[PDB]
Each structure stands twice: as C-alpha cells, then as structure tokens.
Amino acid sequence: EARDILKRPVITEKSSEAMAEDKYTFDVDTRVNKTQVKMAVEEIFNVKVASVNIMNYKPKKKRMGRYQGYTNKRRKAIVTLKEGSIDLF
Amino acid sequence: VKRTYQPNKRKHSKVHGFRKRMSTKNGRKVLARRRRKGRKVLS
Amino acid sequence: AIKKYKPITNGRRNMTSLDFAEITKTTPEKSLLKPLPKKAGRNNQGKLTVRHHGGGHKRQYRVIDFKRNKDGINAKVDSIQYDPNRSANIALVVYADGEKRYIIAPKGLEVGQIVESGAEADIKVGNALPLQNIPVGTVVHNIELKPGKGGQIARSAGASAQVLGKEGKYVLIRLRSGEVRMILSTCRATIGQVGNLQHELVNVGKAGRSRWKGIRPTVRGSVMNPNDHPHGGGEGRAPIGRPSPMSPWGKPTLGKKTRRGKKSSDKLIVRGRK
RNA sequence: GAGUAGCGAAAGACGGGUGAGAAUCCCGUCCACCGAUUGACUAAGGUUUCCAGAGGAAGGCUCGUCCGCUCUGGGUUAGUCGGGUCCUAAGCUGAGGCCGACAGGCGUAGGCGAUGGAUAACAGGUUGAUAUUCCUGUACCACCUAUAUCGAUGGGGGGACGCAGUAGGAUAGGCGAAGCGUGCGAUUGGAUUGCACGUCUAAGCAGUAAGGCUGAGUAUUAGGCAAAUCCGGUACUCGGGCUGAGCUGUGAUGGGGAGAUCGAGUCGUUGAUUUCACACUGCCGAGAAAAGCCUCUAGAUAUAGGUGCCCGUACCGCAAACCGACACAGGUAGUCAAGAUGAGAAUUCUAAGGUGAGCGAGCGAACUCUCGUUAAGGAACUCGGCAAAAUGACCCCGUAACUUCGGGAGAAGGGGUGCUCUUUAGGGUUAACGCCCAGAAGAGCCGCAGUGAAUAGGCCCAAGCGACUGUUUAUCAAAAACACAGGUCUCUGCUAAACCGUAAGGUGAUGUAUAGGGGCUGACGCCUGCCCGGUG
RNA sequence: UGAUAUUGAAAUUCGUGGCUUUCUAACCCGCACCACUUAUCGUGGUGGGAGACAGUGUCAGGCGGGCAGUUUGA
C-alpha cells in the first residue's frame, strides 16, 4: 500500500495558488483517513508533513445525448509541509 | 392551502424501505414480486 | 375546610375548593418517586379500550407502603403531604433506624406522634396488626385480603370498616358499601378512618378544570347515529324506544346484574349490598 | 372556433455602451416601492440550481446580445460548530420464555431511539466561488514520553425540572452635547461653532463583584441486599462556606478606523421583550429519566516536547431551487429587528439593506369591474337597511331599570383638544450647573375647520331560544344542534364490573365504594303530581 | 344451565344406588419467601389459601338484530 492511498495530483487555479504556500493537493482513495494520507506522503516523497485536510465530493450528473450517468465520487486532501518540497513534475 | 405529501427523508425510509420490507413475511413478498417483474429499484 | 369563591366570572360562580390546611410540607421526599407516563385508556394493541380518558397534568408516582412490615420498631410522623394519584393525603414516617417511607394518613394523626406495626401494638390510630388481635367493634382501614400482599379495601378519603365477629379462622366485617363479609384472620388492618373527609363536597365549577384532571367529554348515546349506538337514530329528540336502555355495545345497563357465578368468594360473602 | 380569449396583483424615464439585430442586456444619473420587512440569519425539504469563460435551436406566456436554460472548465478544508466513537424518554425490538390450525401474536433480562441532559475557540484578514474549518495573533481540552496512589458492576449525594406575579442590580441598544477628531463653507433673498459624518477592540488568564441560597461541630448506630470514615436516624454542646450577572486590569502593543504614511475614541441622560433566573413571593392542577459529576467502602497495585479519527459544510431557503402538473396572488418551524410619532412589535413617513414585478404603444365609445363626489328628500328601496354611510383616540363632567351584588357600564348624554409669551408648584439622576419626565393658572394670535393626515365602538327600547367560555357538517348549514359545571338511577368487594384479543398478554389502575363503568338530564332559583294491569 | 372425562379418600344418612358432609395426596392461585439472576417475565423449591370444586374437551337445553345471509304479488 501507500501507492493505493494516493491516486493523482490536482492541477487547477486554486491548487497552484496553494503551492505558492507549501500546500499540495492530491486525489486519494475514497476509503482512507487523514492519518494514512499523512504517513503515505513521506513514504513516497520524503517530506515532513504539518497537516492534512480532506474533502468528500459527491457524484455529479453528466449527459451525452441527454443520458443518465454520474461521475465518480472523489476525496481530495491538502497536505501542508514543514520540511522540503514536492516537485510533482 | 396545505397539501398532502410533506416530504420527510427519515420517515420515508422507515415506512418504505429495504429493512422494513425484509422484516415482515408480506414485505418479502413485495420484494420477490418486484424482482420477477424486474424493477430497477425495489424500495 | 372548603374555600368558596366569589362570582367574579361566570366560570367561578359556584365553585369550591379545599383549603389544604393539613398539608404540612409542600414537596415530596426525592428518594421515593417514580415516573408515571399516561396510558390514556389504551392497551397493548394501541386501541382505545376505555372511553373518556385523556391528557391532564403530569404526575410522579409516590411509593406507598400498603403492607406494614417493620414490626416492633416505632415510627414518628414527620410530615403530611399531597398526593396527586389518590384522593387521600399521605404521611412520611421515619423509623427508629433511619428508614423513611410513606403511609396513608388516617383521620386523626398529627405531625410528631408515633406509630408501630406487628401483633403486639396498642389499639390506637395509626397502628397496624393482624385481624385476630383487633377487638370487635373497631373501625379499621387498609385491609389486606391475602396475607403478605398488602391492603386493598378502605383506602379512599373517609373510608373505614368495622369488625363484627370471629369464626375459627375468619373474621366478620362490614365494608363501606354495607356488604358483610368474612376475611382471613391473618390479614392485617390499620386502626382508624382515612383522612380528607371533605374531599367529596368540592364543586369542580368549570369544564376546563375537569380537563386538568384527565377526563374527556361524554357524548350521550341518544345523539349518535344507528351505526354507533343502540340509542342513535330518530327524527329529533327521541325516547329510548326499547324495553331496556343499552350500553354502546348492546348490553342491558339498568338493573341487570353482572357478577359472575361459581366464584370462590361466593362462600365468603354473607350479606350483599352495592 | 380565430388572428379570436388570454399574456398571472405593484413606476418608470432618459443618456452612453455593446451588437447582424435593443422598450426588454450592461454601466450612469434621477425618480419610485418595501422597511415587525420586498432586509439579515437559519431548520426542514431540494440535490449542483453555486462560480468563471462561451452560446442562442428548444425552454422563458413578448423580445433577448440575457438567464435558475445549453456547452466545458472549476468550487465545499474543522481535537473545540452540529451529529457518531457519551446518556436516556415515548416508541420500536427482544436470548431463554408464554400463547396459537399454519403463517404468527405477546413478552423478560438486554439493546435501538432526540424534539431533551452532557460536552474543550476567540477576534481580525482573505477568494470569482469556503471559512469560529484556510492565514495572522493569542487560547483551552484529552491523552503519550522525558524530566502513597487507583477504586467499584455495588451504596449515598447530585443532576432534577410546573404555572402566574411584581420589585430590583446590571448590560446591549437608542439619544443629546462650543467634550474632540475631520472636512467642508455656499453665486436664489439672507446667515456664518455654519453645515455634515466619526467618537473602539473578543475568548482566555487573575482580581472583586449587586443579588440569591443556609446553623456548624463531636459522639453514637436494630436502617441503604456485603461492607463503609459516605448517607439516613438519635443525643449533645456551640450559634462561613457555595453560588452569581456585571465591572477593572492585560490581553494585544497589536487589530480595526470618519479620514489625510500618519489619524480622535470623552461626558450626561434614557434603558430593555436580554441576563442575574423558576431567583424571590403566591397558587393548586402538584409539575421526566439516565449518564457525565462528587463522595463511600468489596477490592486492586511542573516545566520541556509531542498525538488527536469518521460524517455534514457549495447554493435556494415566506421562495423562480421547498409542497401545490406552471418562473402559479395559496401553504411553509425558529432567531435578529434602527429613527420621528406613540401605551405599543398599531398607524403614516423614512434607515441598514433590498427591489422596479419577463409583453408593450395608443385612444380616452358602450357595457363589466375597483375607487371619489353629488341639488332637494331621507328606507319611500327590498323577502330583509343587503351594501354604503355614520361612530371611532386621549381628557373631564355625568350615567337608568334590573341583579345571582360580581355586574349592567365605554350604559346613555355632554364639554374640551392648534401655536406664541408671561409665572408657577415638583420628581428621576448628580457637589452644582446640567440632563431627562410631568402639571396649574393667565394674556394673547390665526383658520371653514386644531386626535387639522393615518389607524382606533354606532346607540336604545322590547320579545323567543340556549345559563355561560368552549366544539361541529375540510369544499352550500356555526345554530335553538354537541360539550359543559351540577343533578339522578344503576351495575361493580378486587384476578372488580366494563372493554380489546383465538389465547397469552393488557387497559381499568401501580386505583380500591368520598373509587370505577354505563343510561338519562343539563348553571342557579322554586319545584317535579297519579298509575306496577302490559313489558323489562 | 345439566350429563360425562380429567377425578380420588372416610364417614353419616334413606333407598347395591343416590343425597349431603369431612379429608387430602390430583388440579388451581395476576401469593409470601428463597435460588437460578444484573429480572414486577418464566421455571424450580418452601410455607399459606382453596380442593375433587374450579378451569378445560365432548354432548345437551335456554337466551341471543350483538352480528350475518335473504324474502317482502300481478
């Protein structure tokens, strides 16, 4: 594990403004805690984490020829760093 | 004028719903019936 | 006695009330109270099985001692108190150990005097003891019916019975309704009359004061329809066009007797009177 | 049918701009409308309607360059907010159990279950879209590691509770100031402290604080399922604790400001429907439980660094996002709520803030609707004064029969009410001045009219019915019908009668003949005659 | 409301049968105490009360608009 916890990073306007500070955003597994997201970011990137905030997002409607269908439900986590940087590039 | 049907999330699931249905021998008959018709929602 | 009101309003025109001059304290003893949620004439199934019961004031149950058990240990009356659940007042008696419990207050006990139980006590107001030890001609109350169970007869305000005779193991006695009956000689009773003798001369006065007591209104059978009552139907006002008046379930309800035969108390009762 | 009915309550105008196209979109100015709400919050319910770019097929009762509509990109951050890892009520379930053709019904211990009890965070800044959640500052709570005590699964205390009434202490808020800050100073006849605004900042810590409650010691022991130093009794002497709004400091040396990097934050007075608080007094209708919490014993062996999970969090929310098939004149719990006028949360006009109603332009026929006025008469109208008109506030003088002595009563019927100037008695707060709240007498001045607008009973005489407040045919009947307080008859001795059910289990009732069930009558006053042959 | 089954014992009495008494072993107690046991359920033990009655099955008679199904000319 610890690579099942993290799925992919988020890259938008509000997230690039957050890594002007030391705040990094990922999209994580929908069944994990704060304390697993914190102990998985150091095992992968070797940083020192100061905090983790999590959000649950619900499925959104989406049509293609006016159809049924919902997007996946999401869980994204903002981690603050005390020591280091994550160059996700 | 007040109308019938003032909605209520918690009343709805306690009077109609899976666990209520599966509690009675006649509620399991409802759910069997809807399965052999092939309804997409059973409760 | 009976506080009478001035006719300031049509509501309080002819309305009376007790003065409560006997009640010494006005707050229960906290360690002797239970909750009493209303069950307003509705049974297991949730259906109304008794008419005219409803929503009154909220009440707590006080734990009354109807079987006087502590024998040969004196008790001093500490307080006379108000009980919402019965028509009589109650007394708090402190034992010589430090054990408090309520008692139904007799007609003539004041705060301070002592009481006691058992088959060796004085024949005076407040005492309890078996019926073989009571001299003929005493008025008693709180009379047991099976030994050990507790008293069941003569527990309303102003209620008493007096001993009449003695058989081998039974005892003759006449109840408040004038019926004569023999009770087993091992069943206790208390000496005196139940207090609160002026409870019956109260004039309730309002419709809304009987709603405070928990009584709900009565519709006469005559003003119903034929699917509701045998008395329903008719042009305007009608007489009872039947040989006998009937109840809302169709039984005869004036003069027709309802006590059931082959009872084990058919031996024990001597002179009948309702 | 027919280019006919309708286009769903209410005010817009013009200028500029954008565009292929403008009454309808965006910006501006003026004008209007709500303001105990057409404002600000927040439950429920709805589920992406929220935000930014782009679009004009359909939806929108017109148009549309626009949108709650279409397109593709985004947006919801918590040890302390609300819920779970805490408690229980009604109810719902229930090992064994009891009952029953089957199916199953009931029920014990034990569990589930808030609309209640418990429970540690505040102020400021910030985005197009979130914030007691992010950021800055300052906190508090639980646990963990470094550097006698624990204590019931059990006992006791506590928690812990109704309704009404008045007085008081505070504080929030409002108001006024030649108190002081800032920023103006007039082109219409005048004037120049003259005109407008501003006048402060938490939790936490540690101090003292109106008010409210109330003897404290020692010895002892037949009770609290065993125990007890705790509780409950008894005998004795002798007669300061535990709660509580506010206020002061200091926070924090910062933060916010009417404004020009600097920048004032005084005094007086009115004051709550908030808080002290169900406190205190009174009444009878006699007013939850359980845990946290504090003790008792059965028993048992003080600074320095860290750790803190899950779910909700967007937006609408008296509404075009909710229930009414609609962007529908209806319905939808709770909190906040300024100024003038007033008893007022009434009335009329305004503030903070929001809005101008998703078809218009003309013309000013009949007839229909909603509103205003009317000579002379004044109910002649009509089934019927139906509808309309008239009364209407505060003050003073006055007031009939009849009565159950309470009433009738605002009975009736009259008079006053604007402004200016003199002089006159006091009552809140303060050392005074001040600052508020009220009165009396006189002399004048103006008009058709002085509660000059708005809002605010028409009265009287006599008769029938029901005493009275109350209830009822959701959607043609509100009453003389139903309730009722009181009266009477009757059944019922307790596993009570009565009622529900096949029974078991229940209600009655944790009641006990001054109690309970049923029939009739219907306050109170004076009374209630005859018949027991027939039916019960 | 009777007969009969569950249902037994001893006596007195007048005709092997009935009647009435009394006794207790069956049956009953929404009855006290003690265990299971944290328990106002239940089951078991122990005292008391009642007792061959009552309750329960089968068969029989009365009552029975409380409730059903129907008829009520041309």
Numbering used by the authors:
A (entry chain R): 2 to 90
B (entry chain 2): 2 to 44
C (entry chain C): 2 to 275
Passage from the reporting paper:
Pleuromutilin (PLM) antibiotics inhibit bacterial protein synthesis by binding to the large ribosomal subunit at the peptidyltransferase centre (PTC) and preventing the requisite positioning of the A- and P-site tRNA for peptide bond formation. Instead, the Vga- and Lsa-type proteins mediate resistance to PLMs and other protein synthesis inhibitors by target protection; they bind to the ribosome to drive antibiotic release, although the precise mechanism by which the latter occurs remains to be clarified. Sal(A) is revealed as but one member of a larger group of Sal-type ABC-F proteins that is likely ancestral to the genus, and which shows considerable variation in the ability to mediate resistance to antibiotics. From a mechanistic perspective, we have established that they do indeed function as target protection proteins to mediate resistance to PLM and other antibiotic classes; like other ARE ABC-F proteins, they bind into the E site of the 70S ribosome to effect dissociation of bound drug molecules.
